[PDB]
């Protein structure tokens, strides 16, 4: 089960304000027009790889998706990140958890932290021992596919945890669909508007025109 | 593929002309940058300045090189535009024989006085120790010098170059410009409304060209783009590490003691000095390329505007009549007026006419035949004159010439 | 006679401005340096340290340390500094092996387990521990940069109290992280009041510089810490005590040019401070800069000394330097009409003169005799 | 215009020779006071700074001199062209061979240059006249042949 | 006048390629015979020359 991630999974790469400028950056982005795996929550939520970090997205009306689990074994041999979200609070823990074979939310912890119509986008990545989460919530009118438009994810938390990860799984309330695409090291040219919001991007390995735009540092090529 | 219809007795003579105002755009000066090499290389640090003195005179000869460029950009702007010894002005009444200069002469309605065409040109072209010095001649004084070159050219022709400006009526100046290209001056006065309406229409096409198509200014916009790209590269080179621990000098000096910091800072001094010597070398080679264009623009001002040029395709394509200088941002634009011959007929021709056993040759012009009668015409406009002893001269007899033809030559005294 | 660039002038900073985090917890270095046991180097401990004040003189002035080797910082500078996290790594080794813990050294410890980065920024602090850990004590034991690694591949040391590098040595590595993010660890430097609209020697979360700070109109997004512009120069910053965003403007500077008649004429001069308002410096303001000592005159004359932007200066009437807008020439309304011609009734023959360079000095420079000169050792 | 070329030749040689006195980061700027003080493992580290600095000082001089030789050759080609057109000829090129209508020129040599004494006719004493493009006579129009 | 321009183009390319054989103060002028002999802390000091 697949769809095409048009110009999705781009995020503010560093905590610096820039405006009216075209910045060429190299980071783990989701490639433009990549294949993204599109799961159904019923008939059921399988374990996925975490190859360089992921763009994860959900379409919802009632926020049934309420966490994620990450690690290399998920069976108390080693530390595992657990992120849970009851909409009133995010809760994050890194304990040596013994997970059930079917994880859900019912209706050695070296770190802890606390804080359809909706598309909720998240980018999860590891860099030098920091697990970074970028996020955005957006209104859409489409269950079947990702939207054909550009929107830029802004940092939600950076948590220093020092944990090795190769696998993950999303979890949901047990009394719907979600997308997974894998990040890759890419040069991108990012456009910042007069307000310093990034409003467009060019993936410098997509096609020879994007490689030309990125060579000239311009979104128009004469 | 134009197979020209040549044969040993065929000539084509143009029965009508076209007056074309071409446009030629030239760089004249470039941005008078000056870069304070100690403020660039070190910037507010004594710890780096006391190292930069170990490299010696390099900083002083970089400031000397950029000052030599910055002085000569005023020399270039002065030599191109200040050809004129006085500020000439046109009269209140614009009776230039029907030629409509209102679009190239200044308008008092503007806050800086410039022509209608000069405002199209001025619209179509767009802190780490780096600075831009102002030009000595502000763009209002360039507009006064080109207005004096215009009001000289329009009221007095070339005479304001050769001496004091002596006035002459513009329909009589253009009859000198026609005489100069070897078109007999009666061709102007007998076609004066046609020549005026063609000049006025051709001046109309310049406005549409410059309004529609920004790449018309491409030879000036490319010089502004090279000045800006070289400053952007020179400032991007401040962010480079060159092999130091960091590219920001305060984040070396705040972290490290002198035995350690001087080893790191010598990499940034050596890299920023190589970055400035690269910029100043590129700018000296680029200043020689702009000076070769300023000397060409000064020469087109001296020969095309203050004169009329016999140099083929120098003052625009065609036989040159005159030129009008319009200023543009860091350049000049010449509106070269040229006579272009336009509507040929094929005629039979002869090198000489055999009459009375003598051979007759044309004083000025060519012999041609309309198929029944022989005429002599001026070379660059078909105007057939009956052959006489007044438009022809004798030499020898009919034996010596390859291609001579028999005809009568009329004697006006008969 | 001329205009000579003699100097560069810069407005100097009036006072110094330190804005660090409003944090008062002292960092847990006591728990790193006074642990109940130290790890074996096969299984070295790592402690992140954050959201705290780090006094490093408490460490560096402690005479108990056998070394304090700092590789991208000097130990007396550490209180002037801000870092994202410190990362203290703690373990025990033989004293013969402390010298392996440097960025590019090699041996049975460093090439296998505790490899330092090639660009390590940090301090390695080490001391003998024979008075605490010798017994021998066959428990202390050894098996990519900063790798954890968990016949046998494992062997242990022979620490007895009679053993100098044959003793147990205890090491703490402080791996300071200087990335462009919230500097959660800073030195004990007391933060000062904010100053605005005036040139100052500022330092915000360790972002040292100099400039005129002014309140911005720019909307930073809540996660941003500072701002750039078209090139990678810092154009704005966020204060850590109140989250307002300040522009940085560089303190006013320019060339200084001395407008002078020749000393063969006079010793009186006028001074042009380029690209500045006179409020930052018998005074005049031109687009070229503030001009001091030259009188502005409503008349216009030929350009004797070119100042710029149409202004020139000259020495005139008992006498002074004057500055004026330059004159291009006399205004000659040519007496044109559709039937008037002027014809010259006489000529003048003028011998002009034109002077041209044609050649220049045929120098030749013997580069070996210049660069080295009589020396084979340099040749 | 000639004294400025002699001044630029001399200022570039004086700068190139002043750069022999600079340290470039060595212990000393005199090569014998390195070689008389230090052994080869030490002296070669100091001398590489003076080689690198004096090589950068010579590549700067030769680059300035090549750009300056192109500027003098563009003036030698102009002086050769004014010799060909103004001296060996008479020039129709307005304001090329001096201001005025050109009559002739005399080349005088000067140190590292040439001086042209351009003789020009300049018209000097105007009267204002009424004028006409043509004369109507016998119902014909007459135009001047010359004048 | 043309053969001298072809000779200057070729002499400048020959000089630029001869400068690949020079040591500049490194242990060797062939980059693979630095990289095959030395580890990064040592090789980066030679390669910067």
UniProtKB/Swiss-Prot annotation, chain D:
Superkingdom of the organism of origin: Viruses
Annotated effect of mutating residue 23 to K: In strain: Omicron/BA.1, Omicron/BA.2, Omicron/BA.2.12.1, Omicron/BA.2.75, Omicron/BA.4, Omicron/BA.5, Omicron/BQ.1.1, Omicron/XBB.1.5, Omicron/EG.5.1
Annotated effect of mutating residue 125 to H: In strain: Kappa/B.1.617.1
Glycosylated residues, chain numbering: 128
Coiled-coil annotated spans: 3-47
Disulfide linkage: 86-97
Protein purpose: Subunit of the fusion protein that is processed upon entry into the host cell. Mediates fusion of the virion and cellular membranes by functioning as a class I viral fusion protein. Contains a viral fusion peptide that is unmasked after S2 cleavage. This cleavage can occur at the cell membrane by host TMPRSS2 or during endocytosis by host CSTL. In either case, this triggers an extensive and irreversible conformational change that leads to fusion of the viral envelope with the cellular cytoplasmic membrane, releasing viral genomic RNA into the host cell cytoplasm.
Name of protein: Spike protein S2'
Residues of the full protein shown: 947 to 1093 of 1273
């Amino acid at each position: 089960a697949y769809t095409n991630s048009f110009t999705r999974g781009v995020y503010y790469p560093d905590k610096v304000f820039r405006s009216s400028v075209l910045h060429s950056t190299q980071d783990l982005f989701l490639p433009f027009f990549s294949n993204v795996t599109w799961f159904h929550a019923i008939h059921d939520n399988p374990v996925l790889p975490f190859n360089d970090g992921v763009y994860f997205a959900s379409t919802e009306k009632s926020n049934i998706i309420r966490g994620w689990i990450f690690g290399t074994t998920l069976d108390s041999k080693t530390q595992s990140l657990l992120i849970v979200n009851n909409a009133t609070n995010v809760v994050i823990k890194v304990c040596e958890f013994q997970f059930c074979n079917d994880p859900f939310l019912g209706v050695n912890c070296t770190f802890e932290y606390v804080s359809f119509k909706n598309l909720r986008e998240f980018v999860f990545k590891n860099i030098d021992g920091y697990f970074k989460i970028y996020s955005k919530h957006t209104p859409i009118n489409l269950v079947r596919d990702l939207p054909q438009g550009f929107s830029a994810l802004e940092p939600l938390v950076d948590l220093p945890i020092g944990i090795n990860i190769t696998r993950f799984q999303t979890l949901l309330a047990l009394h719907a669909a979600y997308y997974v695409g894998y990040l890759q090291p890419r040069t991108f040219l990012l456009k910042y508007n007069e307000n310093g919001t990034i409003t467009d991007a060019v993936d410098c390995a997509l096609d020879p025109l994007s490689e030309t735009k990125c060579t000239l540092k311009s979104f128009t090529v004469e | 593929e134009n197979s020209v219809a040549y044969s040993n007795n065929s000539i084509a003579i143009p029965t009508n002309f076209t007056i074309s105002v071409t446009t030629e755009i030239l760089p004249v000066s470039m941005t008078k940058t000056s870069v304070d090499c100690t403020m660039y290389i070190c910037g507010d640090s004594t710890e780096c300045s006391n190292l930069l003195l170990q490299y010696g005179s390099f900083c002083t000869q970089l400031n000397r090189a950029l000052t030599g460029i910055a002085v000569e950009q005023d020399k270039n702007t002065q030599e191109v535009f200040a050809q004129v010894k006085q500020i000439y002005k046109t009269p209140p009444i614009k009776d230039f024989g029907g030629f409509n200069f209102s679009q190239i002469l200044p308008d008092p309605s503007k806050p800086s006085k410039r022509s209608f065409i000069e405002d199209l040109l001025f619209n179509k072209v767009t802190y780490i120790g780096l600075t831009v010095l102002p030009p000595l001649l502000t763009d209002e004084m360039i507009a006064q010098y080109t207005s004096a070159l215009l009001a000289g050219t329009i009221t007095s022709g070339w005479t304001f170059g050769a001496g004091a400006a002596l006035q002459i009526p513009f329909a009589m100046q253009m009859a000198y410009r026609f005489n100069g290209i070897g078109v007999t001056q009666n061709v102007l006065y007998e076609n004066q409304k046609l020549i005026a309406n063609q000049f006025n229409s051709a001046i109309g096409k310049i406005q549409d060209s410059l309004s529609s198509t920004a790449s018309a200014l491409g030879k000036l916009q490319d010089v502004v783009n090279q000045n800006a790209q070289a400053l952007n590269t020179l400032v991007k080179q401040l962010s480079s590490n060159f092999g130091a621990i960091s590219s920001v000098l305060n984040d070396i000096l705040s972290r490290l003691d002198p035995p350690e910091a001087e080893v790191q800072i010598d990499r940034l001094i050596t890299g920023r000095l190589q970055s400035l010597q690269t910029y100043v070398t590129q700018q000296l080679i680029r200043a020689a390329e702009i000076r070769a264009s300023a000397n060409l623009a000064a020469t087109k001002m001296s020969e095309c505007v203050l004169g009329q040029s016999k140099r083929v395709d120098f003052c625009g394509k065609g036989y040159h009549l005159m030129s009008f200088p319009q200023s543009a941002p860091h350049g000049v634009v010449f509106l070269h007026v040229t006579y272009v011959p336009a509507q040929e007929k094929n005629f039979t021709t002869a090198p000489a006419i055999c009459h009375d056993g003598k051979a007759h040759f044309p004083r000025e012009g060519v012999f041609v035949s309309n198929g029944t009668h022989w005429f002599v015409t001026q070379r660059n406009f078909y105007e057939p004159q009956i052959i006489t002893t007044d438009n022809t001269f004798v030499s020898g007899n009919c034996d010596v010439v390859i291609g001579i033809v028999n005809n009568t030559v009329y004697d006006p005294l008969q | 006679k001329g205009i000579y660039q003699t100097s560069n002038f810069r407005v100097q900073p009036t006072e110094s401005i330190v804005r660090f985090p409003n944090i008062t917890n002292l960092c847990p270095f006591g728990e790193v340096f006074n642990a109940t046991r130290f790890a074996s180097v096969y299984a070295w401990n790592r402690k992140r340290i954050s959201n705290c004040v780090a006094d490093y003189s408490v460490l560096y002035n402690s005479a108990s340390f056998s070394t304090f080797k700092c590789y991208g910082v000097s130990p007396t500078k550490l209180n002037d500094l801000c870092f994202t996290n410190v990362y203290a790594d703690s373990f025990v080794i033989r004293g013969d092996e402390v010298r392996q813990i440097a960025p590019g050294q090699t041996g049975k410890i460093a090439d296998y387990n505790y490899k330092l980065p090639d660009d390590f920024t940090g301090c390695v602090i080490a001391w003998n521990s024979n008075n605490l850990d010798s017994k021998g004590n066959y428990n202390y034991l050894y098996r990519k940069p900063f790798e954890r690694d968990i016949y046998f591949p494992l062997q242990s040391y022979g620490f007895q109290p009679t053993n100098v590098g044959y003793q147990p040595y205890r090491v703490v590595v402080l791996s300071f992280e200087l990335l462009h993010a919230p500097a959660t660890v800073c030195g004990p430097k007391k933060s000062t009041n904010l100053v605005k609209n005036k040139c100052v020697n500022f330092n915000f979360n360790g972002l040292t510089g100099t400039g005129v700070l002014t309140e911005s109109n720019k909307k930073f997004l809540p996660f941003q810490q500072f701002g750039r512009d078209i090139l990678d120069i810092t154009d704005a910053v966020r204060d850590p005590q109140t989250l307002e965003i300040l522009d940085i403007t560089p303190c006013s500077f320019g060339g200084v040019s001395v407008i002078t008649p020749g000393t063969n004429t006079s010793n009186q001069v006028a001074v042009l401070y380029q690209d500045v308002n006179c409020t930052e410096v018998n005074v005049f303001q031109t687009r070229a800069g503030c001009l001091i000592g030259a009188e502005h005159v409503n008349n216009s004359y030929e350009c004797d000394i070119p100042i710029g932007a149409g202004i020139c200066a000259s020495y005139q009437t008992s006498q002074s330097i004057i500055a004026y807008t330059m004159s291009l020439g006399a205004e000659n309304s040519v007496a044109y009409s559709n039937n008037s011609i002027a014809i010259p009734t006489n000529f003048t023959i003028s011998v002009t003169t034109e002077i041209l360079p044609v050649s220049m000095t045929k120098t030749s420079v013997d580069c070996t005799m210049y660069i080295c000169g009589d020396s084979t050792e340099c040749s």
